[PDB]
């Protein structure tokens, strides 16, 4: 420990840079929420989207289905005579997650404002080939690389609060009536691309590739068993009265 620093530089650099990066992240998040815009939806695209969801749930949950009704559904989807997939046919800079440019600009402005500065030292032993990285404005060759400048301080700061931001924020799930509309919107946003023919053919062949295994036949497992949960359960239902 050396290089006795002033107490009036830590109160005008560290707290300002921390608050700046925190509120810059908050601004970015809230502005991203604000700029989000809904997408126009045609009733037809919603229609094939829901048809695809129906085929998917048929593929996923098909064990608990009467065999006759299962082949009825499979034939209706396939129907080699007419078929619904076969005839019903429709007709047919480099912005990449822009979050690096703002942080780079902020770091560049912060480094431009502070020319010759010593913010804090890092306990971690660092090599001398990272000295041009870290100081960038201090004319010292005998000094160690532990003492970093404000640029690296802010660069480590933006990653320090990356997981902290999610602590304050979170996910939301409400509006049961609007939940269905959200599901249709997202599902048809999945089904935007105009490749209906190949998707229909792929689903048509995939549905044939599925087999049937009635999971309802295995009933004998339950018959030879013990029913004791239904009274520990029944004991804890009695105490509650009627409001």
């Amino acid at each position: 420990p050396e290089l006795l620093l002033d107490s009036n530089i830590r109160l005008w650099v560290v707290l300002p840079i921390v608050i700046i990066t925190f509120f810059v992240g908050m601004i970015r998040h809230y502005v991203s929420i604000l700029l989000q815009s809904d997408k126009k939806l045609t009733q037809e695209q919603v229609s094939d989207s829901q048809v695809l969801i129906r085929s998917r749930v048929l593929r996923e949950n098909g064990k608990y289905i009467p065999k006759q009704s299962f082949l009825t559904r499979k034939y209706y989807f396939n129907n080699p005579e007419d078929g619904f997939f076969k005839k019903t046919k429709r007709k047919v800079m480099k912005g990449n997650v822009t979050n690096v440019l703002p942080m780079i600009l902020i770091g560049g402005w912060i480094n431009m404002t502070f020319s010759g500065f010593v913010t804090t030292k890092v306990p971690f032993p660092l090599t001398l080939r990272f000295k041009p990285m870290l100081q960038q404005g201090i004319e010292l060759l005998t000094l160690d690389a532990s003492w970093v400048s404000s640029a690296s301080w802010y660069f480590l700061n933006v990653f320090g609060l990356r997981s902290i931001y999610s602590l304050i924020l979170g996910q939301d799930n409400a509006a049961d009536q609007s939940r269905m509309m959200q599901e249709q919107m997202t599902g048809a946003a999945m089904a935007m691309p105009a490749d209906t023919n190949k998707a229909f053919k792929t689903e048509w062949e995939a549905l044939e590739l599925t087999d049937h295994q009635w999971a309802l036949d295995d009933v004998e497992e339950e018959l030879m068993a013990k029913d004791l949960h239904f009274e520990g359960m029944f004991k804890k239902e009695l105490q509650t009265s009627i409001f």
């Binding site: 290089l3 006795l4 509120f23 601004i27 809230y30 929420i33 604000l34 020319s115 004319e139």
Partner: protein
């Protein structure tokens, strides 16, 4: 940046040598006051304020000394050197009126001669040659030889307004001859031959009174000669029976004659010096003598005239006075008080309004010289100013009547500085309180918890008091002398060759304390050391000072305090022969104090802090301390070492022939120096280790014979531990002043070449190999290797009067070299430019890593000038002190003046940048919060609207 920070944390004080020939003329006298000193500097002080108006410095090695000075109504005439060059100055403005080259003689006397109306010629008499020059212009027409000059001494030339120049010649013991010339053309009129076996000296003694009356006192028969050179034939003897005939046994009497130059005639009043202190005013009309005002003590006298009236100032030792053998003391409150009174010259009246009294602070100093400036004012009021001179070096001015008798005091004893040092402040009250509160010897957990609670309560109380103070606000430096976060204010001690100790503060520059030594003669050696620091509370700081004489050979040691000034009650006796040498022991004992031991002529070690543990530690170390002594006239470099308890034994011996080579200077390694990096990078990635020697001395030898071609300059690198020369370098065409500076591992020495008129700059560096040694414990007994030595040459177009290197505590900043110039400006240059690893041809890796092509041309850039306006007339030396932050060194340049500043090695990397606008930062910080608060509601309402719609 420099133009913005003009005088924020820098200061210069201009000083002047001892007053030798000062005049208090200029009847108008606005502020003019001329002073010519004994350091070949002529200055002009101000009566009202006291600052310097114009000052001139010519010489100071052995020539250019001022011999005599005359003052006209508006111009000043003075003679420099010894009678070769003369120049006249002005006082309204400042510069040269005219110059004159004299002949090859011995300057004895000068005077003014006036033909009929006023002075037009100045008579200059040498040992044999006599000349007269003009006063307005410069022309030599009057010059001739006197009849006998071999066995004749000519002094006290007297001139009259009638138009006759008189010359007096008195031999040691034989005859006396008075000779006379005309003013129009050199013509010898007549010569008077008078026999005086009792006339020995005439340089300072006999004077001219009345109208060409020669008066000579004698204590042998206790009688007076009076003789007339204008008329009469012979001398006449006056016995002293009307007066109190009291002549000192071993004392040659002195006369004090006055004769105004503007007035053709002269006065008939004069003082006679009797014994140590016995003055008396006597008047001689024709043959009868009148004595009045028989002055009993009358330490000092002065004469003055303003018009047709003449005044005599008498300075007495009064105030309850009690006179000792030679000094005077007043036993009332302050002691050493003197009075100044005025008396008439014609009659013996005493002015009732004139009464000056003043007392000094230090004891021992006695008045030496005094001038008087009396001017007429109003109708019935006489005002005058007295300039009393202190015994060693100090000026003082007094007013007629005012609130304070002392108007302005200027310290002239701070010009010649021998040794200098800087010490820190003791502590701060809150910091000391915290240090005392933390101090725990042996306690439990409960005790520490209670102490922490008490400290927290004290802090809370202090915070409450501070909050109350700010709420209220919303609605002597010696006593405090506190420290701060960055210790930049330090108490510096100055030691004068005269024998006065001075203490000045680095911030303001005001004299805090000043002490006087009993008796110090010239050519004395001084050495100041600091044993006990200020960081520790339990005993007051200890500062040691060794002083020794060269002619007699006494050595004394003083123990004083650098903070307050009062000396401690611990002082060791010194016996046998004078102390030879001393070193400071890093090891500490007793309380927190270091050990100092000294060597006598008998080759014995004497320890100052006599302590059982001190002796135990010294005996434990025993063969650990070595001693090297260097002699110039002897030319012997012999070494000793301690064995067992206390005894001297020869270990390594070296002799150099004095006739061939001569020792000049010897520099070593500073004790307070720490190295951060012990190696350097090389071309690819391979490391290069250095060769650091804490025990190594470099000696500089010069050729005795001086020739245009035959010149010998060399340096020897020896180890003080074991006699072994590492590298010995020799030049072939180097002569003149040689300056050597030693550093971490590189030596910088400068010289001058006779073949081509230039100054060559040689930098020497020591480097080891690629593999390191033990590198755990360094010793000169082991390590049998020879380090590589690298030399390079450059050109510096200057003289390099002074030279130093900036030294830091840890040593992580750059190493700048401070060089002084004859101009006065101090220039700092980086060591990187003067590096031995300078490839001639530009090669790939060298230019790739960090290097500049080698080129022997160094230009003095005006931007790298620490001295922007403030300059030092004579650069004797500079001292660099490491500060506390990281990159700050306090540089103080001493010499004819004093100047202090802070030097920046590499800009600044420890303090906030000055150009830091807080308005923009605060605005952005508040705007971010405002924007997040604005956009929160926008996001909420957008979510709500999307949910509803």
């Amino acid at each position: 940046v420099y133009e913005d920070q003009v005088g924020k944390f820098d200061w210069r004080q201009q000083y002047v040598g001892k007053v030798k020939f000062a005049s208090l003329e200029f009847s108008p006298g606005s502020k003019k006051l001329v002073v010519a000193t004994e350091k070949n500097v002529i200055a002009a002080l101000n009566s009202r304020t006291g600052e310097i108006l114009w000052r001139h410095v010519d010489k100071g090695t052995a020539e250019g000394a001022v011999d005599a000075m005359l003052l006209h109504g508006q111009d000043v005439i003075t003679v420099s050197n010894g009678g070769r060059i003369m120049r006249s100055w002005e006082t309204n403005i400042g510069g040269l009126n005219w110059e004159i080259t004299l002949d090859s003689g011995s300057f004895q006397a000068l005077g003014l001669v006036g033909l009929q109306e006023s002075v037009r010629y100045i008579a200059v008499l040498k040992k044999t040659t006599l000349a007269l020059h003009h006063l307005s212009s410069g022309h030599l027409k009057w010059v001739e030889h006197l009849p006998e000059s071999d066995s004749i001494h000519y002094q006290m030339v007297y001139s009259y307004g009638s138009g006759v120049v008189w010359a007096l010649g008195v031999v040691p013991f034989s005859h006396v001859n008075i000779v006379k010339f005309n003013v129009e053309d050199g013509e010898i009129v007549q010569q008077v031959r008078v026999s005086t076996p009792w006339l020995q000296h005439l340089s300072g003694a006999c004077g001219v009174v009345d109208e060409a009356v020669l008066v000579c006192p004698d204590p042998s028969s206790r009688s007076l000669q009076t003789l007339a050179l204008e008329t009469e034939w012979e001398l006449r003897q006056i016995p002293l029976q009307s007066l109190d005939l009291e002549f000192g046994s071993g004392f040659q009497p002195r006369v004090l004659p006055t004769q105004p130059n503007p007035v053709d005639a002269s006065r008939a009043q004069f003082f006679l010096h009797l014994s140590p202190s016995h003055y008396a005013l006597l008047q001689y009309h024709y043959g009868t003598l009148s004595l009045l005002k028989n002055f009993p003590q009358t330490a000092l006298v002065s004469f003055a005239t303003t018009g047709e009236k003449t005044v005599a100032a008498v300075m007495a030792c009064r105030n309850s006075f009690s006179e000792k053998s030679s000094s005077k003391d007043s036993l009332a409150c302050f002691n050493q008080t003197y009075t100044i009174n005025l008396y008439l010259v014609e009659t013996g009246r005493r002015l009732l309004d004139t009464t000056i009294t003043f007392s000094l602070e230090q004891s021992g100093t006695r008045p030496e010289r005094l001038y008087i400036q009396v001017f007429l004012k109003k109708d019935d009021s006489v005002g005058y100013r007295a300039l009393v001179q202190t015994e060693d070096h100090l000026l003082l001015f007094l007013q007629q009547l005012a609130g304070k008798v002392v108007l302005w005091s200027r310290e002239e004893s701070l010009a010649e500085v021998v040794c200098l040092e800087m010490v820190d402040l003791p502590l701060t009250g809150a910091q000391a309180e915290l240090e005392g509160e933390f101090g725990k010897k042996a306690d439990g957990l409960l005790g520490m918890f209670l102490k922490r609670l008490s400290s927290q309560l004290i802090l809370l109380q202090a915070w409450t008091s501070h909050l109350w103070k700010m709420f209220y606000d919303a609605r002597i430096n010696i006593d405090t002398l506190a420290r701060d976060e960055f210790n930049l204010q330090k108490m510096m001690v100055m030691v004068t060759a005269s024998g006065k100790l001075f203490g000045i503060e680095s911030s303001s520059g005001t004299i805090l304390w000043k002490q006087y030594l009993p008796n110090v003669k010239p050519d004395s050696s001084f050495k100041l050391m600091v044993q006990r620091t200020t960081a520790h509370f339990p005993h007051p700081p200890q500062c040691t000072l060794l002083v020794k004489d060269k002619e007699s050979g006494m050595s004394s040691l003083y123990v004083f305090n650098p903070i307050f000034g009062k000396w401690s009650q611990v002082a060791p006796p010194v016996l046998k022969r004078p102390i030879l040498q001393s070193l400071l022991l890093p090891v500490m004992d007793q309380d927190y104090a270091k050990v100092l031991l000294l060597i006598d002529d008998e080759y014995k070690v004497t320890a100052f802090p006599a302590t059982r543990n001190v002796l135990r530690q010294l005996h434990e170390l025993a063969p650990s301390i070595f001693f090297y002594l260097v002699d110039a006239e002897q030319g012997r470099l012999c070494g000793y070492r301690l064995r067992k308890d206390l005894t001297t034994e020869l270990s390594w011996e070296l002799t150099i022939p004095p006739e061939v080579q001569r020792i000049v200077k010897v520099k070593g390694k500073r004790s307070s120096e720490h190295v951060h990096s012990q190696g350097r990078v090389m071309g690819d990635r391979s490391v290069l280790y250095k060769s650091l020697n804490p025990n190594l001395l470099a000696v500089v030898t010069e050729s005795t014979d001086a020739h245009h071609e035959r010149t010998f300059i060399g340096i020897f690198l020896i180890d003080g531990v074991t006699g072994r020369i590492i590298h010995s370098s020799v030049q072939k065409k180097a002569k003149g002043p040689v300056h050597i500076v030693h550093s971490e591992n590189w030596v910088v020495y400068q010289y001058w070449n006779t073949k081509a008129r230039r100054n060559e700059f040689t930098v020497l560096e020591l480097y080891e190999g690629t593999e390191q040694y033990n590198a755990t414990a360094f010793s000169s007994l082991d390590r049998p290797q020879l380090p590589q030595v690298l030399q390079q040459s450059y050109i510096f177009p200057s003289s390099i009067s002074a030279m130093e290197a900036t030294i830091t505590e840890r040593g992580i900043t750059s190493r700048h070299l401070l060089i002084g110039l004859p101009s006065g400006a101090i220039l700092s240059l980086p060591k990187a430019l003067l590096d031995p690893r300078r490839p001639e041809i530009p090669t790939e890796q060298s230019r790739e890593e960090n290097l500049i092509p080698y080129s022997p041309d160094v230009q003095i850039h005006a931007e790298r000038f620490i001295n922007y306006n403030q300059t030092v007339s004579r650069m004797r030396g500079i001292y660099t002190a490491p500060s506390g932050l990281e990159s700050t060194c306090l540089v103080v340049a001493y010499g004819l003046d004093i100047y202090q500043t802070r030097v920046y090695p590499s800009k600044q990397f420890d303090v906030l940048k000055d150009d830091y606008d807080y308005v923009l930062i605060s605005s952005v910080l508040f705007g971010l919060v405002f924007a997040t608060m604005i956009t929160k509601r926008l996001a909420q309402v957008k979510l709500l609207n999307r949910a509803w719609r």
